[PDB]
RNA sequence: UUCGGGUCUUGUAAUUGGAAUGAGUACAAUGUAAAUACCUUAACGAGGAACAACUGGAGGGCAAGUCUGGUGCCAGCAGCCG
RNA sequence: ACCCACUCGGCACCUUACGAGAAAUCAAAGUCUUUGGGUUCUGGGGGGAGUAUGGUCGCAAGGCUGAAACUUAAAGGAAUUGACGGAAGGGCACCACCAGGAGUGGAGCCUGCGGCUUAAUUUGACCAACACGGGGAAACUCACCAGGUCCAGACACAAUAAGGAUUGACAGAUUGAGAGCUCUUUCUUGAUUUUGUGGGUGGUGGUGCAUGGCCGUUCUUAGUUGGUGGAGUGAUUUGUCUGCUUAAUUGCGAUAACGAACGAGACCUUAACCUACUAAAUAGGGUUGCUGGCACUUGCCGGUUGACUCUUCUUAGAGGGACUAUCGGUUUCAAGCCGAUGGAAGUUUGAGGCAAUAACAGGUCUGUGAUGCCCUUAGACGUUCUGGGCCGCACGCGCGCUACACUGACGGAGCCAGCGAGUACAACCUUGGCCGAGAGGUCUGGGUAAUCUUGUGAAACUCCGUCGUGCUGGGGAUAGAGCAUUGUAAUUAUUGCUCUUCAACGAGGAAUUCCUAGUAAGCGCAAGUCAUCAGCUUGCGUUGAUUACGUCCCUGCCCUUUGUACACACC
RNA sequence: CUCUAACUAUAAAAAUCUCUCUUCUC
């Protein structure tokens, strides 16, 4: 939520974060945080919205 | 923090201009409150307590879509209570909207005396009761310093009210916290709904604050 | 292909004579023991068995009437038992 | 899934070839000629230069430094 | 000016000191029909003050652990849900 | 007999909550925590059980009265959201059908599974597994098997130890080895090492039911979502709908809903059309040269990197173009549908690319130096070398290929494309000239590419002949022999070529697959696999149709209504 | 501000299903 708040503070017209994995439980689950609006179809998906994927190692 | 609060309601405009000084003016003329910032302005010290968080599920074709119901009680322990009940996706948002509703639904209560009057009122004025669902709550005046003889949720509601001594009796499925708290809220707000001999003489019907100060509303 | 497990310090083999209901079986243990066999853990609804199936079963030293069936052999490890011959060979169980 | 068993070997063992250490090895290579001149019991290798001693095993002499290219019958 | 004196206090450390005291023993005397015992009191009687506080529980109801090792729907736990 | 008004009594009814209820609902089920008009009967969780017993009534059937022992954590009521219905309404889909076409299933073979077999025949998938893991593996690949090597065990400490911690080896035994792997002997080497402890690495080892990422599927359908506001005590609901329209939650609208967000659409790529612009020896054309031939009239078909000129085609940039444009019907006359005309184009213009919320215990640890945990970590599940296997074969199944011939096979002759690709620190695409009958060989020359292969002179196809209904000149499987190519290596035939034997096969049961226009189908070519190998896939083009232009009958999908004792949801 | 008219007409068969349920706190 801090990341989303900072991003929307930067002037972005919408931010979204997916955190998938073992969030404090053995069974896997994905949490979705969003604000604003994110398009999904047509090169507007390439022209405006930029994405990033990362892996984080925990214990 | 950051708060501008452009007022969208005439009541909100009057409050922001500083023309309504006490919440008693709001309660007296039965004014409709739709901006929580009015209640924040009038009662700076409204404490809260999240009574319960309850997961409620809806069965759709794919999995079970789960939200959370927050039961928030707001008040100042000086004769003002509100009971917000909200449902939302994220628990924090649920609690925020629940306190928000609770502030919107503030209500005054009529604390009285069990026997002779010596100091400030310590208990309710008369016996009162409310009923939500199948839960019926009966509040009965108690002698001074008898504590709040009530279940923990109702006890916390009375503590937020400012009622220091009161007896209670609940009938039904008082298990469900929302029903019990709503019934107790109905009773404690009904305390100002009982005509009493000391409340018989008629008054002069002082003009409404938005009639005398209509000019300061209507943003031009 | 899995390794076949032999008996040890109390467990013994047997053959199902007739399978009862409610997870119960009649099993002839090869000591002349027409014992009652209880379907047990890891064996409830994960592996299925039937009439005339080679079986391995653990005894209960505090009650010899009933005994708890543990592992079932798939009619080929049964053949291996049959050649190594730890069980009596006076019985024919074929297909 | 994989079902692996403990490996069984039809070979007793192959043991690490331990180097044959020799105490006082160097002096056996030489011979003191009575407080003065000294000689060498082993033969010198021509390809490497002075000092390196030939290896005599049986009806030939063998080198150590250029070992591979020198094995000359006695 | 980073500090920082700790300027003012409150805990944690097998460091470290001096006190006080019984629970026990016991001259007596009181007590009692006679004795115990209690009240009083000589003389002893605390350093790990070994003069050593247990009984249940730590998912919820219900205060308190999603620490470590063991067993892996066994052994067992569980008033109920588990 | 009606009509109007009123009243008493009765079966009833509509609206509403301002009252009551857990609600469905009730004008009584109201006047009940602000609890008392009179009065009778009945119930105290479910089951056992309205059972036994004892009475009593009855001809009998059976009625009335009527427990316990024991067992159980629930049984049950109303309603909400889903799912389901051999329930209803309205719409859709050649992964549905109708009308059809081509088929598969019958035969050979090729490949992939299962089973069997084996030392191993390594393994993961069982609509959404099965020509799938780019899985066309002779070595490698590799993961399996019989064996043989090595540490590529950092680092810290201890320990030996510089009068040797150690390393390596000629030659022989040993080995498959020209392996100092192990031994015989001896020689070489210098603090890197060696043997113990901790620890660390490596692992196509296990767990996709611990995970990420990605992809597939639910679902190619049109469906989702929250903010104020309304209704509910509430789970939830309205907004998201009575209609009509659309491919569409697409719009016209009506409205306790108002404004919005994602999806759809829009958007990009591609395919058209551009005698309008910019231009071009890496594309074409004209005129004229310099020539060749034939005609003889000045003309025809050619060659030339000689000159001048142009951009119609070929290119690729900026742009234009279609927005259902005009007109006629039909439509609460609105959204829109149908037809004709003009057009290049009137199915969203065709074809695609991205493609929402929620989810699957769908697949992948075997793509990853992505990875938690567990296992192993020295004769190793690490790594490498040799050889074998992944291809075996009493048997079933799934993609396909070649065929059963006359609309044909075989000879000649005609001669037509579009996607590609192509060599450097390596050796690619190959023209052309000589050889060979062919595969192929050799000598040269282009091309790091609109330049050269290349106009890829491809097959089907076309013309003229041979064959003549004969399992035949169809079919080309199975074999024998030989010649070559790639390869360290070709046997268990890599592949190509030459001669011969020429098998099953007579249009294929039940059943089942794909598809509505340059589509299906026939035909091949290029690219990815590639040192050599496709019967595979991804693309491209040639010839090019029959039959629809509809429906909910089978299989499903979307919305609404209804019922449910279902929610691990009709498996 | 005056008004009661049009219509039909489908019932063949279809039984059963072994797991396993997992925390919401700013
Ligand atoms: Mg959009
Ligand atoms: Mg789109
Ligand atoms: Mg049982
Ligand atoms: Mg204890
Ligand atoms: Mg315990
Ligand atoms: Mg414990
Ligand atoms: Mg607690
Ligand atoms: Mg009962
Ligand atoms: Mg009953
Ligand atoms: Mg009787
Ligand atoms: Mg019900
Ligand atoms: Mg089908
Ligand atoms: Mg058909
Ligand atoms: Mg065919
Ligand atoms: Mg076939
Ligand atoms: Mg077949
Ligand atoms: Mg196999
Ligand atoms: Mg599908
Ligand atoms: Mg091959
Ligand atoms: Mg190998
Ligand atoms: Mg191999
Ligand atoms: Mg080996
Ligand atoms: Mg690996
Ligand atoms: Mg390996
Ligand atoms: Mg999975
Ligand atoms: Mg989707
Ligand atoms: Mg709302
Ligand atoms: Mg809705
Ligand atoms: Mg042009
Ligand atoms: Mg018109
Ligand atoms: Mg399209
Ligand atoms: Mg799975
Ligand atoms: Mg691994
Ligand atoms: Mg294979
Ligand atoms: Mg396939
Ligand atoms: Mg021909
Ligand atoms: Mg071409
Ligand atoms: Mg040709
Ligand atoms: Mg023939
Ligand atoms: Mg032929
Ligand atoms: Mg053909
Ligand atoms: Mg392939
Ligand atoms: Mg159609
Ligand atoms: Mg249920
Ligand atoms: Mg059924
Ligand atoms: Zn030498």
Swiss-Prot record, chain C:
The keyword Protein biosynthesis applies. Belongs to the eIF-1A family. Present with 35100 molecules/cell in log phase SD medium. The gene is TIF11. The keyword Protein biosynthesis applies. One of its GO terms (biological process) is formation of translation initiation ternary complex. Keywords: Initiation factor, Protein biosynthesis. Residues 1-74 form the S1-like domain. GO terms for cellular component: cytoplasm; cytoplasmic stress granule; eukaryotic 43S preinitiation complex; eukaryotic 48S preinitiation complex. The chain holds residues 23 to 117 of 153 of the full protein. It comes from Saccharomyces cerevisiae (strain ATCC 204508 / S288c) (Baker's yeast). This is Eukaryotic translation initiation factor 1A. One of its GO terms (molecular function) is double-stranded RNA binding. The lineage of its organism: Eukaryota, Fungi, Dikarya, Ascomycota, Saccharomycotina. Seems to be required for maximal rate of protein biosynthesis. Enhances ribosome dissociation into subunits and stabilizes the binding of the initiator Met-tRNA(I) to 40 S ribosomal subunits.
UniProtKB/Swiss-Prot annotation, chain D:
A zinc finger (C4-type) spans 45-66. It comes from the Eukaryota. Part of the 40S ribosomal subunit. Component of the 40S subunit of the ribosome. This is Small ribosomal subunit protein eS31. The gene is ubi3. The chain holds residues 77 to 150 of 150 of the full protein.
């Amino acid at each position: 939520y801090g990341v989303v708040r900072y991003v929307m503070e930067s002037g972005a017209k919408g931010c979204e974060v997916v955190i998938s994995g073992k969030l404090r439980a053995a069974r896997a689950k994905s949490m979705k945080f969003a604000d604003g609006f994110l398009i999904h179809s047509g090169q507007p998906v390439n022209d405006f919205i930029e994405t990033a994927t990362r892996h984080v190692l925990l214990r | 923090e950051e708060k501008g609060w452009v007022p969208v309601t005439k009541l909100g405009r009057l409050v922001k201009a500083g023309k309504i000084s006490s919440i008693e003016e709001i309660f007296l003329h039965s004014l409709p409150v739709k901006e929580f910032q009015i209640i924040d302005q009038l009662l700076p010290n409204l404490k809260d307590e999240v009574m319960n968080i309850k997961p409620v599920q809806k069965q759709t074709r794919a999995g079970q879509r789960t939200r959370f119901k927050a039961v928030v009680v707001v008040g100042d322990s000086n004769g003002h209570v509100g009971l917000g009940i909200k449902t939302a996706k994220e628990v924090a948002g649920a609690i925020r909207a629940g306190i928000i509703i609770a502030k919107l639904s503030v209500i005054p209560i009529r604390r009285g005396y069990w026997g002779t009057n010596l100091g400030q009122p310590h208990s309710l004025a008369t016996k009162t009761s409310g009923k939500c669902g199948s839960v019926s709550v009966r509040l009965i005046p108690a002698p001074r310093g008898s504590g709040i003889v009530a279940s923990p949720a109702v006890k916390k509601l009375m503590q937020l009210a400012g009622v220091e001594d009161v007896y209670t009796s609940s009938t039904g499925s008082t298990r469900t916290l929302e029903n019990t708290l709503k019934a107790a809220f109905v009773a404690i707000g009904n305390t100002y709904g009982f005509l009493t001999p000391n409340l018989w003489e008629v008054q002069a019907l002082t003009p409404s604050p938005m009639d005398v100060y209509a000019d300061y509303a209507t943003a031009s | 292909k899995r390794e076949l497990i032999y008996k040890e310090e109390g467990q013994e083999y047997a053959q199902i004579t007739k399978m009862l209901g409610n997870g119960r079986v009649e099993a002839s243990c090869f000591d002349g023991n027409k014992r009652m066999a209880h379907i047990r853990g890891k064996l409830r609804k994960k592996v299925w068995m039937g009439q005339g199936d080679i079986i391995l079963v653990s005894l209960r030293d505090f009650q010899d009437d009933q005994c708890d069936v543990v592992h079932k052999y798939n009619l080929d490890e049964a053949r291996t038992l049959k050649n190594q011959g730890e069980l009596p060979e006076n019985a024919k169980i074929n297909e | 899934g994989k079902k692996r068993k403990k490996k069984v070997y039809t070979t007793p063992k192959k043991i690490r070839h331990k180097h044959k250490k020799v105490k006082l090895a160097v002096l056996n290579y030489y011979k003191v000629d009575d407080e003065g001149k000294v000689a060498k019991l082993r033969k010198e290798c021509p390809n490497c230069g002075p000092g390196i001693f030939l290896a005599n095993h049986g009806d030939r002499f063998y080198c150590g430094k250029c070992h591979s290219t020198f094995a000359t019958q006695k």
